[PDB]
Amino acid sequence: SMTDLLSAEDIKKAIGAFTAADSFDHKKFFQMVGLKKKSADDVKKVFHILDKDKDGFIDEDELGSILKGFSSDARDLSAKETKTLMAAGDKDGDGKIGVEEFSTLVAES
Numbered sequence: 001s002m003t004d005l006l007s008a009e010d011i012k013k014a015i016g017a018f019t020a021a022d023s024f025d026h027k028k029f030f031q032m033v034g035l036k037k038k039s040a041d042d043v044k045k046v047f048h049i050l051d052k053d054k055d056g057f058i059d060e061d062e063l064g065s066i067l068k069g070f071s072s073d074a075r076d077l078s079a080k081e082t083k084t085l086m087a088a089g090d091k092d093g094d095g096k097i098g099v100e101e102f103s104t105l106v107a108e109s
């Protein structure tokens with residue numbers, strides 16, 4: 001489960017900051033949930049959870065469910081939030097996010 005990687009305390013606080021539609025701030029979210037200070041291996045484990053079908057990429061549909069990846073009862077991102085986040089993490093141009101792109105996105109501040 002995600003609490004095997006991050007504290008429930010930090011997850012509830014991070015999720016709690018973005019309960020409104022179109023409120024997602026990825027830099028703020030990753031910092032609050034505590035994964036910015038995790039090892040590159042733990043970040044990869046977080047990536048595996050988010051990459052729902054395990055094909056190696058977080059596509060847009062999986063991305064919309066990112067919050068649920070940390071907390072099951074979380075909302076889905078709005079279509080606008082998903083498109084904006086994908087633009088932010090997809091830097092090699094294929095419309096999805098791979099593990100190296102994910103570590104780069106999380107490393108931002």
Ligand SMILES: [Ca+2]
Binds near residue numbers: 052055058059
């Ligand atoms: Ca996938």
Ligand SMILES: [Ca+2]
Binds near residue numbers: 089092096101
């Ligand atoms: Ca990509």
